[PDB]
Design a protein around this nucleic acid. Structure first.
Ligand SMILES: [Mg+2]
Ligand SMILES: [Mg+2]
Ligand SMILES: [Mg+2]
Ligand SMILES: [Mg+2]
Ligand SMILES: [Mg+2]
Ligand SMILES: [Mg+2]
Ligand SMILES: [Mg+2]
Ligand SMILES: [Mg+2]
Ligand SMILES: [Mg+2]
Ligand SMILES: [Mg+2]
Ligand SMILES: [Mg+2]
Ligand SMILES: [Mg+2]
Ligand SMILES: [Mg+2]
Ligand SMILES: [Mg+2]
Ligand SMILES: [Mg+2]
Ligand SMILES: [Mg+2]
Lengths: 57, 52
RNA sequence: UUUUAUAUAUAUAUAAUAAGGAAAAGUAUUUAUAAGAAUAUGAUGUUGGUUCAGAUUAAGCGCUAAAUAAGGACAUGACACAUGCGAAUCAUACGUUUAUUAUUGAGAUAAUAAAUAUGUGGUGUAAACGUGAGUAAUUUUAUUAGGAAUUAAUGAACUAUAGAAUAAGCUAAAUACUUAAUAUUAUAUAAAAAUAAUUUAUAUAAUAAAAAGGAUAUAUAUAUAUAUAUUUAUCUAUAGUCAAGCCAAUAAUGGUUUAGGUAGUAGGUUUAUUAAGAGUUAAACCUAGCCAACGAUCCAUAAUCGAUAAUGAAAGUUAGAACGAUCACGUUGACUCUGAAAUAUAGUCAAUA
RNA sequence: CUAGAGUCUAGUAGUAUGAAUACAAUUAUUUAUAAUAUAUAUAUAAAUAAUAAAUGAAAAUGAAAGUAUUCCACCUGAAGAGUACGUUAGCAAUAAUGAAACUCAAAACAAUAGACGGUUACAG
RNA sequence: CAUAUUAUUAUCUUAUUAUUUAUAUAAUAUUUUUUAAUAAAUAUUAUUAAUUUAUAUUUAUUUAUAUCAGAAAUAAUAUGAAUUAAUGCGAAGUUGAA
């Protein structure tokens, strides 16, 4: 939306976020960085556990 | 001569006619209703949203 | 097709069977409007350029030329200029200067006639006129049923209303100048909603900022004042009108054989300045940005436009002379006063002659 | 041509009928499958050849040079000229980008008839 | 190699102007402490002009910043150039056989 001159080239200001898909991207990145991490840790645990189970054999 | 065809084939300009009342009168209810009606915010919106 | 019948394992193979037939007489405006020719070839068809037929002009020149009416007329050297004009006006602002009459005794004072714009003052030259140098947009032009900072206790010069017009000084005197007197915004309380602010009302704070008399008459009284009326001025306040300042979106020539450009540069935060936003200008501190092959930056050129002119079938293209709108400039550059508005055709300084 | 290695490697450089989608009548061959009992002169597809219609200046194309859609690149008379200058890379060589003035009414393509060739043969 | 004009600047110079520093027995108004001349009345007491004094309004002087315009340097935009590259045309021809 138009406003008073706020700088040499900035005559508009954010009025309404019609869709926040960029915010969704930021949140999903931040979440994923650790959400994948927990699954990776338990996957490594399972893999080494099956290694040990075969080692008993 | 061509452009004059847009205006009824009239060559020459009168000064733009002035308005005796520069703003709507109180008795003119409709303009007041539009002015004091709920302002739409959305894809076609005119004002900052609630939290903005 | 469908429905059933037999047989065989709800289903399969066979046989039969089929509901769709109704009639009736009478009950224009068409729209916009686009043509080619000559020249290749030994001849043909095609591509392809060149030229021609049409209209026009801010026109020039050659030859020629009767009268009248209307419309235009230095596009080039924004080159230099002899000479005369283009902005004056007011004597009812203040002063001076005479002549007569009356009273006073060289003058003094009145009344009536005049003269006085070389003395002090008011209003006018921000317009209009001319020009197109600068200007490719950092403030220019065009358009929008566009905005705010939500533009000033600005009226510039008229309208309609109210009021006021005081005292001194300096001028020789004043409607000249000074000094002084008197006459919206910010707070706080609430109310709402067109609300996450604005508006409204109230009460305070300061608003608190002015002025000027002349011309006539009369009426008092004691030539002196004074007091009314009529005229023309002056100041303040509300609103109206006419006006201003600022920003946005879209468009505005050619060259990338100009490919990188920009460090106030791009953004944020404060402060000063403004009536008012903003790196607009000045100061300070932060961030590293911004523009760009849909062409930046740089260079060259150009005043821009129309319901204007030319042309076309039209989209468009060209001009920007003439009519009109906007801007810029008044030999060149910078700054200052006044003012609401000026880097003024003003003033100061410099440059050129 | 340049470097490193002992002749080799590592290089610089970047020259010398566009793509996709929908559709489009036959015939004859093949080709590869799918069947049905060598025969159905078997059907479904792709490759090849001559066509039809269609297109084109024609030659010719003929499932594309056709009917349509979408994206990109390219062209604007001949010569000057892919020249000059500048830039870009490159040690350089070269490459890329790339004009302008002057001159002309030309120039070019397909096809037609000809005479020409040591052009071919063949005859009389 | 030579002439010309705009643009800029870690440079030189600078009119005027704007802020900005400092200084004035520097002025003018008012406020004091005071000195002379003059008036009225019975020692005066006040008055004007001058002496000192501390607030404003300016002047001179200076400090800094910016600044018209000038140089100097650079770059471009042009205009001319000995020397020099290429190519276009035409006159009748001359030479090769691509
Ligand atoms: Mg001929
Ligand atoms: Mg005439
Ligand atoms: Mg002229
Ligand atoms: Mg008089
Ligand atoms: Mg006078
Ligand atoms: Mg003017
Ligand atoms: Mg006055
Ligand atoms: Mg700037
Ligand atoms: Mg010009
Ligand atoms: Mg033009
Ligand atoms: Mg111009
Ligand atoms: Mg005109
Ligand atoms: Mg004229
Ligand atoms: Mg001017
Ligand atoms: Mg002149
Ligand atoms: Mg000037």
């Amino acid at each position: 939306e138009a406003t008073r001159p706020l700088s040499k080239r900035k005559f508009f200001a954010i009025a309404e976020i019609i869709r926040n898909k960029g915010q969704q991207f930021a949140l999903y990145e931040s979440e994923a960085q650790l959400s994948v991490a927990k699954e990776e840790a338990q996957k490594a645990k399972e893999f080494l556990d099956k290694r040990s189970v075969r080692e008993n054999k | 001569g061509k452009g004059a065809a847009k205006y009824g084939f009239k060559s020459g300009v009168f000064p733009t006619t002035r308005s005796i009342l520069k703003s709507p009168t109180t008795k003119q209810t409709d303009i007041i209703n539009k002015v004091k009606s709920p302002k739409p915010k959305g894809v076609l919106g005119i004002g900052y949203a609630k939290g903005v």
